[PDB]
Amino acid sequence: SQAFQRQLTALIGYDVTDVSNVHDDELEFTRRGLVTPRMAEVASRDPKLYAMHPWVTSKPLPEYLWKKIANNCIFIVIHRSTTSQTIKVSPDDTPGAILQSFFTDFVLRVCGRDEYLVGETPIKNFQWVRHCLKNGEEIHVVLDTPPDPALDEVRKSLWDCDRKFRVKIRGIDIPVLPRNTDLTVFVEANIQHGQQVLCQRRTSPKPFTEEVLWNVWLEFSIKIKDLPKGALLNLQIYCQLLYYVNLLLIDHRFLLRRGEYVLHMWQISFNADKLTSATNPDKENSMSISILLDALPKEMPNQLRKQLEAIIATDPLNPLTAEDKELLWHFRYESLKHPKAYPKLFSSVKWGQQEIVAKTYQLLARREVWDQSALDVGLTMQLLDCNFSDENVRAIAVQKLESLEDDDVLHYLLQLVQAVKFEPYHDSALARFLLKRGLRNKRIGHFLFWFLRSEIAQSRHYQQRFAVILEAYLRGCGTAMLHDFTQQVQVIEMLQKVTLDIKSLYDVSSQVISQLKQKLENLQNSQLPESFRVPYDPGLKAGALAIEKCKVMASKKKPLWLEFKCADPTALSNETIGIIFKHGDDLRQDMLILQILRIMESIWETESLDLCLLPYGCISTGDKIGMIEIVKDATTIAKIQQSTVGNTGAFKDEVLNHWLKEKSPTEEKFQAAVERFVYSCAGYCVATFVLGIGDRHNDNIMITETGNLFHIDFGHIRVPFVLTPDFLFVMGTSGKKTSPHFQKFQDICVKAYLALRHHTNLLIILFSMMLMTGMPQLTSKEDIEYIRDALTVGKNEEDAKKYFLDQIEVCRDKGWTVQFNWFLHLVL
């Protein structure tokens, strides 16, 4: 079992057994505490269904997907070695009903993929079947024996103390101070509880040197009994803010913090990193702080109702005044009747007062309206952010998450994993929920692994917490997945080495081309594993490389264009699997944007609208390094303009429509490509403006030979969005004109915009969370408050329609002005 821990450490990228960077047993208690829910999920899941992981959705089949089916008949081609027979199938027919219709144990598995069609669910309720219908692809399956479930085998009093809390600041120690000579420094100790300061105490500004002592006893205005569970002693250093460290006043065992503490401090408003209980690991270079500390038990009038209702109606970013807070609390039993009032009501609570917390806990016990109400993701996500530090408030949100089908868990997984950063303690209801859903489904578990792993590799603030959560997962997923992750980690480690070695060696010379091909030759010849699962697509199995097709892309960060043969021999097409390995940009920023685009698609699915978005695979694997999916038969918009006019930016309107006519053979395929372009442009115009990533150079915008348009490279981040005259010519418009396709485009854009406006609260919370956990540069109140204006908060459907149509005209009025200005900066 000693070699097993060594295996886990290699799969995590962090040692959970290491106690070099702790001042308490929280992580070890969490490791022990997670054993119970781990073994509780392993010994409760269906062993057969877990091995086959049926990717199913209980959501209704949309209006656009029903029109594709003929006489309630879906053709599915079943394969037997060489022979194949197409069968007429009803959408309501279960996989078992189709099997009895074939012969008149064996399971139906997709050709080329490790995706199975099992379970008591209709054929139309499968995610692969819905994908085939959307792309107009034919359903091909191979009849083979189900996988052995034996392969997934798993290895066997505080309220008695009226004293006003005090902290002794002994002093600060830094080995080497920066060259800036000379400034003054003071210690700012704050008692926080969900980004809310309960009390603040500063020190006398002494000069900044390698050693600064104080011995100062800082007494706070808050009593020891009034300190809540999850409150943080935030120790800061100002000149302005340079060093920070946090300490949980109440431990994981409900005890008040007592003793001597030497904490190593992080260097430099809404950032998730400023909340961490973890100290800086680099003890030989980081600023230190010495402190001294010397068990917690478990009818309204008309005008006022209108006031309370107007408060509940406001957006999540709308600030609450003292009057608003006092009203929500006085009428807390009326506020409990409205589930949308819960975030605002729980922000109105005076957490620094015991009696109020007790009354809040009494209020939370009266949960009946909350338990019965329909799950609102945006509302549930609101209670899991930086503004909520109470485990009872946070648990009622985790309670509502339990009703999410494995389909929707995948939609919000990244953001739920990022929400763990807002948890005061390592062991939390949300951490246990992710673990439970990760062991219940192989797909969620695979994605959870990479989501946690991406954070362990490039975040010292949260690497310890996530390493415990991952170790807990890896100790219950099974040896089948354990070996798969081993093969995936091995290939990634080997390929990342080559990416940086090649980058060290503007133009792509013949020397570097042969060097990469030689490096890949040495790796394929007895070193690289024969087969590995694609991190961005668990179904797809990659095998041997295609060294001939392998190259180094003509980009400033020298990315590796890699092509692999499909390891699955039952594969239909002989098309290679394409992966891009890149270093230099934060791919976590691309992971977040792309997952939001997948959320935006599912939002449009509820309104039965299909905006042809292309949220390609992108997984962050390490520090500034990760992988991308190669979208087959696609080119850059700038590259299409470079065919006619290369070196210069004399952009011609006709080029795009000529490129589509060239790549599409039949005239019907051209109209189908223009039809795909009409929807894809519409979706990407709305999605980009809402997120405020509209202003882009056409080098970062792509199109497929099938007509599908898509934005790329979000690692970087005037016009509201990108609507150029060349895009408008495909529609059939030039200058001040109209077209049957432009009239269509304007109608779909407005349909898409107002469809997202129904899920305003969801988008606002997902965006607010994105800027805190994934954007270390965009951490201001004004940065988050952009989404409100973009989505037109508190506006009529007519005004909002008119607002977006004006943004369309701004792009028409500018035309090429923005792209031409982009050409004078990025290119030259």
Ligand X SMILES: CC(C)n1ncnc1-c1cc2c(s1)-c1ccc(C(N)=O)cc1OCC2
Can you say which residues are annotated as belonging to the binding site for ATP?
578-587, 613-621, 710-717
Please identify, using beta-carbon distances, which residue of 620 and 746 lies nearer to ligand X.
Answer: 620
Q: Does 616 bind ligand X (CB under 6 A)?
A: yes
Of 341, 456, 580, 674, which lies in the binding site for ligand X, with binding defined by CB under 6 A? 580
CB contact set of 638 (below 8 Å; sequence gap of 6+): 697, 698, 699, 701
Give the pair of three-digit tokens for residue 126: 């499968």
- Beta carbon of residue 615, minimum distance to ligand X (angstroms, whole number): 10
Give the pair of three-digit tokens for residue 74: 């879906």
- Beta carbon of residue 536, minimum distance to ligand X (angstroms, whole number): 11
- Beta carbon of residue 700, minimum distance to ligand X (angstroms, whole number): 8
Angle at which helices 667-691 and 797-814 cross, to 10°? 110
Find the distance separating the first CA and the last CA of the chain, reported in whole Å. Answer: 59
Please identify, using beta-carbon distances, which residue of 489 and 712 lies nearer to ligand X.
Answer: 712
Please identify, using beta-carbon distances, which residue of 451 and 616 lies nearer to ligand X.
Answer: 616
Q: Whole-angstrom Cα distance, residue 275 to residue 386?
A: 8
- Beta carbon of residue 597, minimum distance to ligand X (angstroms, whole number): 12
Q: Whole-angstrom Cα distance, residue 515 to residue 508?
A: 11
Question: Within 558-577, which residues bind ligand X (CB under 6 A)?
Answer: 559
CB contact set of 662 (below 8 Å; sequence gap of 6+): none
Question: Within 585-604, which residues bind ligand X (CB under 6 A)?
Answer: 590
Q: Whole-angstrom Cα distance, residue 617 to residue 537?
A: 7
Q: Whole-angstrom Cα distance, residue 103 to residue 101?
A: 6
- Residues 194, 387: contact at Cβ < 8 Å? yes
Q: Which helix (H) or strand (E) holds 214?
A: strand 211-223
- Beta carbon of residue 588, minimum distance to ligand X (angstroms, whole number): 12
User: Which segments of 516-610 are extended strands (E)?
Assistant: 532-534, 537-545, 551-552, 560-566, 577-583
Please identify, using beta-carbon distances, which residue of 245 and 495 lies nearer to ligand X.
Answer: 495
- Beta carbon of residue 703, minimum distance to ligand X (angstroms, whole number): 10
Please identify, using beta-carbon distances, which residue of 469 and 587 lies nearer to ligand X.
Answer: 587
Of 195, 555, 642, 671, which lies in the binding site for ligand X, with binding defined by CB under 6 A? 555
CA-nearest of 742, 761, 600 to 683 is 600
- Beta carbon of residue 553, minimum distance to ligand X (angstroms, whole number): 6
Please identify, using beta-carbon distances, which residue of 52 and 542 lies nearer to ligand X.
Answer: 542
Determine the interface stretch with ligand X among 105-113, 342-350, 623-631, 819-827 (rule: CB under 6 A): 623-631
Determine the interface stretch with ligand X among 74-82, 127-135, 403-411, 628-636 (rule: CB under 6 A): 628-636
Of 11, 69, 320, 634, which lies in the binding site for ligand X, with binding defined by CB under 6 A? 634
Grouping H, G, I as helix, E, B as strand and the rest as coil, residue 224 is: coil
Please identify, using beta-carbon distances, which residue of 383 and 597 lies nearer to ligand X.
Answer: 597
Q: Does 630 bind ligand X (CB under 6 A)?
A: yes
Determine the interface stretch with ligand X among 157-165, 514-522, 625-633, 747-755 (rule: CB under 6 A): 625-633
- Residues 21, 463: contact at Cβ < 8 Å? no
Please identify, using beta-carbon distances, which residue of 231 and 580 lies nearer to ligand X.
Answer: 580
Please identify, using beta-carbon distances, which residue of 489 and 579 lies nearer to ligand X.
Answer: 579
Of 193, 201, 582, 801, which lies in the binding site for ligand X, with binding defined by CB under 6 A? 582
- Beta carbon of residue 313, minimum distance to ligand X (angstroms, whole number): 40
Count of Cβ atoms closer than 10 Å to residue 320 Cβ: 17
Helices (H), 104-181: 127-135
Q: How many residues sit close enough to ligand X to count as binding (CB under 6 A)? A: 13
- Beta carbon of residue 787, minimum distance to ligand X (angstroms, whole number): 23
Q: Does 642 bind ligand X (CB under 6 A)?
A: no
Please identify, using beta-carbon distances, which residue of 9 and 555 lies nearer to ligand X.
Answer: 555
- Beta carbon of residue 730, minimum distance to ligand X (angstroms, whole number): 20
Q: Whole-angstrom Cα distance, residue 680 to residue 707?
A: 8
CB contact set of 432 (below 8 Å; sequence gap of 6+): 34, 37
Determine the interface stretch with ligand X among 86-94, 106-114, 305-313, 630-638 (rule: CB under 6 A): 630-638
Residue type (1 letter), 71: N
CA angle 708, 674, 692 (to 5 degrees): 50
Q: Does 638 bind ligand X (CB under 6 A)?
A: no
Determine the interface stretch with ligand X among 135-143, 350-358, 544-552, 629-637 (rule: CB under 6 A): 629-637
Please identify, using beta-carbon distances, which residue of 406 and 705 lies nearer to ligand X.
Answer: 705
Q: How far is CA 520 from the centre of its chain?
A: 32
Of 631, 672, 754, 826, which lies in the binding site for ligand X, with binding defined by CB under 6 A? 631
- Beta carbon of residue 557, minimum distance to ligand X (angstroms, whole number): 7
CA-nearest of 629, 701, 707, 698 to 662 is 707
- Beta carbon of residue 634, minimum distance to ligand X (angstroms, whole number): 4
Grouping H, G, I as helix, E, B as strand and the rest as coil, residue 190 is: strand
Please identify, using beta-carbon distances, which residue of 87 and 634 lies nearer to ligand X.
Answer: 634
CA-nearest of 682, 688, 679 to 711 is 688
Please identify, using beta-carbon distances, which residue of 586 and 726 lies nearer to ligand X.
Answer: 586
Please identify, using beta-carbon distances, which residue of 447 and 714 lies nearer to ligand X.
Answer: 714
Binding-site residues, please?
578-587, 613-621, 710-717
Grouping H, G, I as helix, E, B as strand and the rest as coil, residue 580 is: strand
Q: Whole-angstrom Cα distance, residue 467 to residue 10?
A: 11
Q: Whole-angstrom Cα distance, residue 30 to residue 28?
A: 5
Binding flags for ligand X, 683-722, as an x/- string (CB under 6 A):
-----------------------------xx-x-------
Q: Give the burial class of 622: count Cβ atoms within 10 A of its Cβ; 0-12 exposed, 13-18 middle, 19 or more buried.
A: middle
- Residues 327, 307: contact at Cβ < 8 Å? yes
Binding flags for ligand X, 525-554, as an x/- string (CB under 6 A):
------------------------------
The three state secondary structure string of 336-396 is CCCHHHHHHHHHCCCCCCHHHHHHHHHHHHCCCHHHHCCCCHHHHHHCCCCCCCCHHHHHH
- Beta carbon of residue 594, minimum distance to ligand X (angstroms, whole number): 9
Angle at which helices 742-757 and 797-814 cross, to 10°? 130
Q: Which residue has the tokens 């600030």?
A: 319
Please identify, using beta-carbon distances, which residue of 69 and 634 lies nearer to ligand X.
Answer: 634
- Beta carbon of residue 708, minimum distance to ligand X (angstroms, whole number): 11
- Beta carbon of residue 577, minimum distance to ligand X (angstroms, whole number): 12
Of 224, 474, 628, 730, which lies in the binding site for ligand X, with binding defined by CB under 6 A? 628
CB contact set of 254 (below 8 Å; sequence gap of 6+): 229, 295, 296, 297, 298
Rg (CA), the chain: 29
Q: Does 199 bind ligand X (CB under 6 A)?
A: no
For binding to ligand X (CB under 6 A), which residues are involved? 555, 559, 580, 582, 590, 616, 628, 630-631, 634, 712-713, 715
